[PDB]
Amino acid sequence: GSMHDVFICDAIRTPIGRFGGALASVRADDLAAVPLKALIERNPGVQWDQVDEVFFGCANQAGEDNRNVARMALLLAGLPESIPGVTLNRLCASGMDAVGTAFRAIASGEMELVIAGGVESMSRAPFVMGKAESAYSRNMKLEDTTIGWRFINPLMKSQYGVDSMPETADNVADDYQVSRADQDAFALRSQQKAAAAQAAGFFAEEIVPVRIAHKKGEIIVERDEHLRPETTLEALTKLKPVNGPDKTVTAGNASGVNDGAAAMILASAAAVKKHGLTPRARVLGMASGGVAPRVMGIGPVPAVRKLTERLGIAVSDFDVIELNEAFASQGLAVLRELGVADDAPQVNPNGGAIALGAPLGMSGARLVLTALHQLEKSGGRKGLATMCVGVGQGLALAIERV
Amino acid sequence: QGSMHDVFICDAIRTPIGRFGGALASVRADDLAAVPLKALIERNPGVQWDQVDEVFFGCANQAGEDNRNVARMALLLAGLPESIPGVTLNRLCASGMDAVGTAFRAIASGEMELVIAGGVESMSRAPFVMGKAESAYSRNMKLEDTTIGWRFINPLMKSQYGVDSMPETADNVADDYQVSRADQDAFALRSQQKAAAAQAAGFFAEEIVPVRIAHKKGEIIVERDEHLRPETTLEALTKLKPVNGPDKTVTAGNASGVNDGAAAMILASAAAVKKHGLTPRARVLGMASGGVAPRVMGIGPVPAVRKLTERLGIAVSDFDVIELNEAFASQGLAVLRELGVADDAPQVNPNGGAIALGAPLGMSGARLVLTALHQLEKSGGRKGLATMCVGVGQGLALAIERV
Amino acid sequence: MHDVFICDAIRTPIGRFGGALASVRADDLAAVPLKALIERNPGVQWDQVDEVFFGCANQAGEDNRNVARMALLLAGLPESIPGVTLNRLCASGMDAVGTAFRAIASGEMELVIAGGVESMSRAPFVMGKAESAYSRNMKLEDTTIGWRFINPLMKSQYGVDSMPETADNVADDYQVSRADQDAFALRSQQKAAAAQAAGFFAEEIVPVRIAEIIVERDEHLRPETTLEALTKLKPVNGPDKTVTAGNASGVNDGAAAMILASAAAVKKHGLTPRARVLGMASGGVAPRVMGIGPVPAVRKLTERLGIAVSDFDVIELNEAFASQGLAVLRELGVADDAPQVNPNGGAIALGAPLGMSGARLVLTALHQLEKSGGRKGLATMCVGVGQGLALAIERV
Amino acid sequence: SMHDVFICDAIRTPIGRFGGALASVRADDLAAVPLKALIERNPGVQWDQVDEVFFGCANQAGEDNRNVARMALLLAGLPESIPGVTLNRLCASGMDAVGTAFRAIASGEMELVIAGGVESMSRAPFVMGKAESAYSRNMKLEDTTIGWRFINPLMKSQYGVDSMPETADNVADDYQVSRADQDAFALRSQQKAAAAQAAGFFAEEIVPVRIAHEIIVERDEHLRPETTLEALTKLKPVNGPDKTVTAGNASGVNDGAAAMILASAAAVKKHGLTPRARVLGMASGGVAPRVMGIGPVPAVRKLTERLGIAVSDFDVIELNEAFASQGLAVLRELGVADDAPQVNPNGGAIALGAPLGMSGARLVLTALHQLEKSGGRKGLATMCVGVGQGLALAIERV
Ligand SMILES: *SCCNC(=O)CCNC(=O)[C@H](O)C(C)(C)COP(=O)(O)OP(=O)(O)OC[C@H]1O[C@@H](n2cnc3c(N)ncnc32)[C@H](O)[C@@H]1OP(=O)(O)O
Ligand SMILES: *SCCNC(=O)CCNC(=O)[C@H](O)C(C)(C)COP(=O)(O)OP(=O)(O)OC[C@H]1O[C@@H](n2cnc3c(N)ncnc32)[C@H](O)[C@@H]1OP(=O)(O)O
Ligand SMILES: *SCCNC(=O)CCNC(=O)[C@H](O)C(C)(C)COP(=O)(O)OP(=O)(O)OC[C@H]1O[C@@H](n2cnc3c(N)ncnc32)[C@H](O)[C@@H]1OP(=O)(O)O
Ligand SMILES: *SCCNC(=O)CCNC(=O)[C@H](O)C(C)(C)COP(=O)(O)OP(=O)(O)OC[C@H]1O[C@@H](n2cnc3c(N)ncnc32)[C@H](O)[C@@H]1OP(=O)(O)O
């Protein structure tokens, strides 16, 4: 009759590649399979035919990630054909949704042993073309699915607008009064902290390599590619806003478009013991929230509020906060709404998506796993991961180290 | 750790199912998904809508007007407040049932109180996709149709598991489980007959809200499911040529079609049922999934049903209705045979299924759940089972219980 | 230097965009007139055809890779017969006749076929190759009619006005009023309707068989047109403008072909010489006023031949747009309603498949000379991006 | 009554490799390069007197769409009063432009004209047919770089739709042209071309192409001067182990443009031009598509018979090298030795490349160039055409 505790066990990720960069040759399905293969190699006591489900986040699903990439990935990874899979889409929150969905399946007693993760290959996102609506139609057109609006509904544009994600971040900067200077400082600190974590070997502990064929032999992609460790305030101040001279968001204070995949095991207490797993954290809960599309970046606020209210935990009780850095403007605006200092030590202690990049489907799984990793290294207890969502949402997920 | 919470399906509704290029072909998938959501608003005035915790929607494609989280797109279009979150699930033809069971788990685990679960597919409007060039001046650009089935084939997938088309997998099931053409056609006929009777009885009308269609001289309404072929005879079935060549058994007459449609339903905890003045119609009992060989995807319901009923301690024979998805007569028959249920068992698909009705991938699983409940209400039955197959070798099963 | 005679000539009907001929591949459509010439001319020894010259404005679709050659093979002409495709946009089919004429007049050939084709219904989309790996800048463009792959240097120096925009520019610069344009358009409809009922087009037309459905009537005509109806239409380019769908040609499908021959070949192949070709000339104008292009072309030709415009017993002036048709007539000193101009109507009523239209003008001008007993005839037309072409014949 | 016609100044771009030196240059802009050079090179011309620009172009789906002759003259800075027309006989297109230009002046309908050709095969677009029905599931992209697209079932069933290399394999088979002879032919092409490049022979024909942020392209890119018979021997046939045509014994896929002035004697005098050759004539011939490479044979026969000139009277023969197989077969049918010194003395398309629309204009101008250098009188340029044709053009140095 009682709900069951749920533990995150092993977790692992590919490096994050730049658009057109180190991972651009790797099909989304094959990329998604890389962390799955590593889970298999890294957890040899598991009876693999007992995995109840693979849940994977993926925002696109038009490309080599089409037709339920979770199931494609598990087959490519060498998991038995008897294992089910399902793909979740809450845009940039998809991979976190995977984790929280997996958690709810175990908490409710419907499953014992599951994998949750996320993939996105933005390099390889395809073009789409709608069907002709009439014989001999002269209005055929291609649209890029890399990021952002396509097949725009005129009713959506008239009621809510179809602001680009950078536009929404400018709207957040405007409405919440987040200065260019503050955004650049945040971005700088993101780059510094990530450069420090990379030199410390922190990212290395999370990463499994991806092997790439060249003409004369193979290389290994080993390192997060997006980082700009040489970033300075002077460098950031010189950049032009994406949307015009009177705006504040720049490529230097924004996440990038990127490729990568991540996955982790979740299990009941019985499953941990049966499969020889090492339990690392208990999942406390997940909540979602909605906001106006035009200020989508503030979405984390109702999400975090809803979760912490229900669990009865103060925002200030968390020993780590992984706040997604879609843009410095909205990162800062969320922190301020929540009463957390712009530079508080527990937020993004190893940097975030400004430095690391953000393959939509992967980023939510990455935030959960890195929060856990951070809690282990620092000896912290509770961790909060939260991110915003295109078209105006937030997602939040809380964990507690065992 | 505290108690699990009971979960109730309340009001449910769907659009008609349209033929490919037929009655609903002009309707964008996001607008189509909004249709049942707007009806749920109209039909339950007691609900305080700003208390919906989540809209969960199934959708197999997501490359078209259904792109970038159709659940969230649809709820905004439906006029639900911007404060309501949405998320889209993809287990191919099982997506809409996955929405229901995922909703159920969210409430059962105490994370939510009031949710909407549904599904949509516009297979009419499924776009073409073109991979990016890998090199400057590449001579290798290609368009592929996303309406149904394989695209961007992985060599590794093809080598190991094959990339059989869905009709091909149904031929494989026919061969491996020895389901004869004759038996397939008889199954298909009963589906047409039963659906025709249900339509005439007004049974589908109780499930349906109309879709409005733009027209010169004034918009029209679509009220009735379009796929049905009520005049079908064994003789016409017998004369059809198989999809995959002259030695095979699967034909367009004994297969589900490619179709458009949307459906949605409310799930609520007991406290939400009370607070919003909803009618609890059934309790959700549970959901299970299972995997099989891609090449025989149609048998996927078997592991799913066994997993579910074993954990719940319910025998297959205990269910008052079984809504078994009719992707193909071959797999429909092979599943029943494995589960020890007669090919023409009165509790199985009493109002016909996807052969007559059609099967918009995302919507189908949601239809199966709501129609099962509907049938329990008409018949006074207690427990129902809804189950379906999934391309690339899966099955999904969900059990409910009236009142 | 050799006299050159036009002999037998025929055409398909002209279909509307997406209408009666929309299912017919351009190459098969081109072959239809060629087959009819074979059937209609049994004295001809077909392995002696020196060349098939065909006009075609597009060449991206089933009309790709030298449609002249594709068509003659599809029409059952021996593989020994060569073909060549010419492209001067809407004047392409006239260019074909004029080029055939030059080949025979200079003594390099004796017996040739000249024609044109366009399937505008079937015109494909085009997409540039990616210029970088993982390019996000892929785009489809319609080739049915008008600008695609615009060159920024063309735009900045000459502009890339659409054809209707240039027709507005002519109406403005040459002061051609809306009411005059609509009047001319109505006369075009009325004359074509009269010609249709009299069997005039039927004498030019060979049917297209579609595997069976038979297309045998020009489809674009709107005999129902009234001045009042024309007055109510809205200008394509805004209320301050003049050109409308009703006083403009349409987008259309069709093919035409004719035999040209030296005196020797006429006699050898038992042909009926119907007209002598007198000459062809071209000219260039500013692209933004492309519709006035006929004027330099006609002046150049008539001056060289030593003929006045007023000497022609028929003038077949392409009707891309009423504004330019009228502008041209005015410039050349011919009345807006002169009886020898377009006596059976023109492109506003009949439609204008680009590559076919010039060959149609030449064959119909000849046909009208026969009907009327006239002597000299002039066919002339405008060309996108600023040209004109003119061709003179004399009934034998 | 017929008027004599003279070829005067002539110039070309270098020939670039597919995806190589000129891949960024739009076909219309590329066409404009020789035209602008003709202006620079001929100061006595009153440019508004040019009666017509005739240009060959095989594709016309890309930036070469909608009458590239006229686009090119405008981009070159020529007055807008000058008309233009584009000709398509596939690889023979640029030769057709010259021949057509010739008939225009000879017939007295013009006095001063430009003839040339262009092809950017690098930038050839993809094409997509329109949907035939609402919600059509049958939409498809095809490459227009070279060869069959939108295949007609009736063409395929009667005549076949063999690729260009397949037709060249068919000629090898039907006319018994061995792999070894083909390779030896190819090696001589490369060798002759490397010698001519070193002698500055191509330099004299070339105007550079300038590509901003800036690179000057001034040399033919396709040449393989290190080619040995041993290297060619190692190559695998395009169409499988039992065929004979290889990448090494075939022309390539390429970009480039060329143009030249043609004039009556009156126009020569008025415009202070140098008359370099009189044009004698052009003839065309058809063959079976499946052996398109043999097309030059009927073309050359029809031309020489009409002019009363034996093939052996020619001081230079510029035979297009689409493939060594068909080049050799053409030479043998015409009674000329596989290595005759008057044939392709500076090499040809195997070394140089073949941008379809340009190649025929190149053969005519280079033929004239060679006559000037060697002191010869009569020249013959000839080439094959996809779907089974040949074209031939004869000239005589003044
Ligand atoms: S939850 C995740 C949701 N995801 C998003 O919302 C994605 C948001 N990002 C984007 O859509 C794009 O990444 C935007 C913000 C639009 C930027 O697009 P660009 O393609 O313009 O980005 P690039 O970085 O490729 O180019 C911008 C130029 O700025 C320079 N630059 C960036 N960052 C720095 C730093 N830190 N220091 C110095 N310069 C920096 C880049 O070098 C580039 O300069 P170039 O000289 O043009 O290469
Ligand atoms: S969970 C569900 C998952 N989805 C699937 O697996 C969907 C599988 N279905 C398909 O892919 C297609 O529906 C297939 C099976 C390939 C058939 O596609 P078609 O496009 O051919 O379908 P049509 O509607 O065009 O039918 C083909 C011809 O057969 C005739 N026909 C069908 N059914 C009947 C019956 N009952 N009686 C007589 N004839 C029947 C159709 O009329 C049609 O003949 P036409 O003359 O072409 O109309
Ligand atoms: S050498 C010839 C060279 N070729 C050209 O220059 C081609 C010129 N033609 C065009 O480009 C187009 O045909 C233009 C002129 C742009 C018109 O196309 P539009 O797309 O702007 O408009 P439609 O073709 O869709 O037609 C608009 C409406 O006008 C009605 N209409 C046409 N003709 C008449 C007449 N005679 N009388 C009354 N109405 C007329 C059409 O029916 C249409 O109205 P609908 O309500 O949409 O049917
Ligand atoms: S009138 C003109 C009509 N046009 C034609 O019909 C042109 C016909 N040409 C073609 O269609 C192609 O160019 C063919 C002949 C099919 C070959 O295309 P490829 O893309 O294969 O051409 P590559 O240049 O890539 O050649 C393949 C490999 O062969 C090597 N190679 C070519 N020539 C030589 C010589 N002389 N010596 C040594 N090697 C040679 C290329 O380097 C290439 O090697 P890779 O390993 O592939 O780089």
Automatic annotation (TrEMBL), chain B:
What residues does CoA 2 bind to? Answer: 93, 229, 256, 389
Q: Does the keyword Transferase apply?
A: yes
Print the keywords alphabetically: Acyltransferase, Aromatic hydrocarbons catabolism, Transferase
**One annotated GO molecular function:** 3-oxoadipyl-CoA thiolase activity
Q: Which part of the chain is the Thiolase C-terminal domain? A: 279-402
EC code(s) of this entry: 2.3.1.174
**Active site residues according to the UniProt entry:** 93, 359, 389
The modified positions for Cysteine sulfenic acid (-SOH) read 389
The annotated pathway is: Aromatic compound metabolism; beta-ketoadipate pathway; acetyl-CoA and succinyl-CoA from 3-oxoadipate: step 2/2
Give the binding site residues for CoA 1: 93, 229, 232, 256, 325
GO BP term (any one): 3,4-dihydroxybenzoate catabolic process
**Top-level taxon:** Bacteria
EC category: transferase
Query: CDD domains in the record, alphabetically?
Result: thiolase
InterPro entries documented for this protein: PcaF, Thiolase, Thiolase-like, Thiolase_acyl_enz_int_AS, Thiolase_AS, Thiolase_C, Thiolase_CS, Thiolase_N
Q: Catalyzes what?
A: succinyl-CoA + acetyl-CoA = 3-oxoadipyl-CoA + CoA
The function of this protein is: Catalyzes thiolytic cleavage of beta-ketoadipyl-CoA to succinyl-CoA and acetyl-CoA.
Family of this protein = Belongs to the thiolase-like superfamily. Thiolase family.
State the NCBIfam families in the record.
AcCoA-C-Actrans (TIGR01930), pcaF (TIGR02430), PRK09050.1 (NF006551)
What is the protein's name according to its record?
A: Beta-ketoadipyl-CoA thiolase
Native organism: Pseudomonas putida (strain ATCC 47054 / DSM 6125 / CFBP 8728 / NCIMB 11950 / KT2440)
TrEMBL record, chain C:
What's its EC?
A: 2.3.1.174
Catalytic residues, per the record, are: 90 (acyl-thioester intermediate), 352 (proton acceptor), 382 (proton acceptor)
- What GO terms describe the biological role, i.e. biological process, of this protein? 3,4-dihydroxybenzoate catabolic process
Q: Which residues bind CoA 2?
A: 90, 222, 249, 382
Coiled-coil zones: none
Q: Which PROSITE patterns match?
A: THIOLASE_1, THIOLASE_2, THIOLASE_3
Biological or metabolic pathway of the protein: Aromatic compound metabolism; beta-ketoadipate pathway; acetyl-CoA and succinyl-CoA from 3-oxoadipate: step 2/2
User: What reactions does this protein catalyze?
Assistant: succinyl-CoA + acetyl-CoA = 3-oxoadipyl-CoA + CoA
NCBIfam families on file: AcCoA-C-Actrans, pcaF, PRK09050.1
This protein's name:
Beta-ketoadipyl-CoA thiolase
TrEMBL record, chain D:
Domain annotation Thiolase N-terminal: ranges? 5-265
E.C. number, please?
2.3.1.174
Species the sequence originates in = Pseudomonas putida (strain ATCC 47054 / DSM 6125 / CFBP 8728 / NCIMB 11950 / KT2440)
Keywords annotated in UniProt:
Acyltransferase, Aromatic hydrocarbons catabolism, Transferase
State the protein's name: Beta-ketoadipyl-CoA thiolase
Tell me one GO molecular function of this protein. Answer: 3-oxoadipyl-CoA thiolase activity
Enumerate the PANTHER family for this protein: ACETYL-COA ACETYLTRANSFERASE, CYTOSOLIC, ACETYL-COA C-ACYLTRANSFERASE
Q: Please indicate if the UniProt record lists Acyltransferase as a keyword.
A: yes
Name the domain of life: Bacteria
